Design an enzyme around this catalytic site. Structure first.
Site, PDB file in Angstrom:
ATOM      1  N   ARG A  10       0.751  -1.238   0.088  1.00  0.00           N
ATOM      2  CA  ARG A  10      -0.107  -0.001   0.008  1.00  0.00           C
ATOM      3  C   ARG A  10       1.058   1.496  -0.007  1.00  0.00           C
ATOM      4  O   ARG A  10       0.619   2.255  -0.675  1.00  0.00           O
ATOM      5  CB  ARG A  10      -1.010  -0.002   1.337  1.00  0.00           C
ATOM      6  N   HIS A  12       4.387   1.691  -0.993  1.00  0.00           N
ATOM      7  CA  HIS A  12       5.311   1.713  -2.136  1.00  0.00           C
ATOM      8  C   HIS A  12       5.063   1.241  -3.237  1.00  0.00           C
ATOM      9  O   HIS A  12       5.803   1.730  -4.218  1.00  0.00           O
ATOM     10  CB  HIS A  12       6.668   1.079  -1.404  1.00  0.00           C
ATOM     11  N   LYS A  41       3.778  12.412   6.044  1.00  0.00           N
ATOM     12  CA  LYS A  41       5.101  11.571   6.262  1.00  0.00           C
ATOM     13  C   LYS A  41       5.958  12.211   5.312  1.00  0.00           C
ATOM     14  O   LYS A  41       5.663  12.770   4.242  1.00  0.00           O
ATOM     15  CB  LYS A  41       4.635  10.322   5.435  1.00  0.00           C
ATOM     16  N   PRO A  42       7.050  12.686   5.931  1.00  0.00           N
ATOM     17  CA  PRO A  42       8.224  13.283   5.330  1.00  0.00           C
ATOM     18  C   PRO A  42       8.611  12.770   3.932  1.00  0.00           C
ATOM     19  O   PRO A  42       8.758  13.574   2.989  1.00  0.00           O
ATOM     20  CB  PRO A  42       9.281  13.528   6.262  1.00  0.00           C
ATOM     21  N   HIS A 119       9.964  -3.410   4.317  1.00  0.00           N
ATOM     22  CA  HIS A 119      10.396  -2.200   4.582  1.00  0.00           C
ATOM     23  C   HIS A 119      11.053  -1.391   3.340  1.00  0.00           C
ATOM     24  O   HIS A 119      11.818  -2.273   2.769  1.00  0.00           O
ATOM     25  CB  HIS A 119      11.120  -2.015   5.828  1.00  0.00           C
ATOM     26  N   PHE A 120      10.842  -0.195   2.992  1.00  0.00           N
ATOM     27  CA  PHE A 120      11.781   0.440   2.064  1.00  0.00           C
ATOM     28  C   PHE A 120      12.681   1.226   2.440  1.00  0.00           C
ATOM     29  O   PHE A 120      12.475   2.008   3.420  1.00  0.00           O
ATOM     30  CB  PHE A 120      10.588   1.324   1.271  1.00  0.00           C
ATOM     31  N   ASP A 121      14.066   0.669   2.374  1.00  0.00           N
ATOM     32  CA  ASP A 121      15.210   1.172   3.062  1.00  0.00           C
ATOM     33  C   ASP A 121      15.564   2.536   2.395  1.00  0.00           C
ATOM     34  O   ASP A 121      15.877   3.748   2.978  1.00  0.00           O
ATOM     35  CB  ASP A 121      16.227   0.134   3.093  1.00  0.00           C
TER      36      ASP A 121
HETATM   37  N1  LIG Z   1      14.387   6.707  -0.057  1.00  0.00           N
HETATM   38  C1  LIG Z   1      13.339   6.497   1.026  1.00  0.00           C
HETATM   39  C2  LIG Z   1      14.065   6.849   2.229  1.00  0.00           C
HETATM   40  C3  LIG Z   1      12.720   6.286   3.304  1.00  0.00           C
HETATM   41  N2  LIG Z   1      11.671   5.897   2.794  1.00  0.00           N
HETATM   42  C4  LIG Z   1      10.601   5.557   3.842  1.00  0.00           C
HETATM   43  O1  LIG Z   1      10.887   6.494   4.790  1.00  0.00           O
HETATM   44  C5  LIG Z   1      10.518   5.897   5.846  1.00  0.00           C
HETATM   45  C6  LIG Z   1      11.529   6.429   7.057  1.00  0.00           C
HETATM   46  O2  LIG Z   1      12.877   6.386   6.621  1.00  0.00           O
HETATM   47  P1  LIG Z   1      14.054   6.125   7.233  1.00  0.00           P
HETATM   48  O3  LIG Z   1      13.850   5.145   8.357  1.00  0.00           O
HETATM   49  O4  LIG Z   1      15.446   6.101   6.547  1.00  0.00           O
HETATM   50  O5  LIG Z   1      14.028   7.542   7.848  1.00  0.00           O
HETATM   51  C7  LIG Z   1      10.561   4.568   5.655  1.00  0.00           C
HETATM   52  O6  LIG Z   1       9.649   4.011   6.659  1.00  0.00           O
HETATM   53  C8  LIG Z   1      10.404   4.420   4.309  1.00  0.00           C
HETATM   54  O7  LIG Z   1       9.266   4.053   3.938  1.00  0.00           O
HETATM   55  C9  LIG Z   1      11.337   5.927   1.523  1.00  0.00           C
HETATM   56  O8  LIG Z   1      10.099   5.536   1.021  1.00  0.00           O
HETATM   57  N3  LIG Z   1      12.328   6.251   0.758  1.00  0.00           N
END
Ligand SMILES: Nc1ccn([C@@H]2O[C@H](COP(=O)(O)O)[C@@H](O)[C@H]2O)c(=O)n1
Length: 124
Positions: A10, A12, A41-42, A119-121
């Site tokens: 949902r 990504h 969400k940032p 999880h998307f890293d």
């Molecule tokens: N390039 C990135 C970095 C982070 N993220 C998202 O940002 C959220 C928080 O990222 P960090 O844990 O890197 O702060 C992650 O839960 C992931 O969904 C993303 O979608 N794309």
């Protein structure tokens, strides 16, 4: 609530489009996927590849995750992605995002059986 695998899909996956269309793509998807419901969400990345192709990354290049865990995997190839980043002016609940379309390798954390992305890293 939602399984870890369903939450990742949902937040990504966007296999329906081959790439972000307009500069308004993130503002729309962040809302429609409910990522701006309690807060803005940032950062959030959407992947424009089939789900099967994204789940395959779990059996590709093993790398460390940003948190130090070792269940992260990088795609051998580049994939079409859209990076969504909150703007400096954005203020909840009127969340505004900046859209960046690009072809990059993705890094995801996998777990379970089947072993799928949860999880998307990062995007490299
Ligand atoms: N390039 C990135 C970095 C982070 N993220 C998202 O940002 C959220 C928080 O990222 P960090 O844990 O890197 O702060 C992650 O839960 C992931 O969904 C993303 O979608 N794309």
């Amino acid at each position: 609530k939602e399984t870890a695998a369903a939450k990742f899909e949902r937040q990504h996956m966007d296999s329906s489009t081959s790439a972000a269309s307009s500069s308004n793509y993130c503002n729309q998807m962040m809302k429609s996927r409910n990522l701006t419901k309690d807060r803005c969400k940032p950062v959030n990345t959407f992947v424009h590849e089939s789900l099967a192709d994204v789940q395959a990354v779990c059996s590709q290049k093993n790398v460390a995750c940003k948190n130090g865990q070792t269940n992260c995997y990088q795609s051998y190839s580049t994939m079409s992605i859209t990076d969504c980043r909150e703007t400096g002016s954005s203020k909840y609940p009127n969340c505004a995002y900046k859209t960046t379309q690009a072809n990059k390798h993705i890094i995801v954390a996998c777990e379970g059986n089947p072993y799928v992305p949860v999880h998307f890293d990062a995007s490299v």
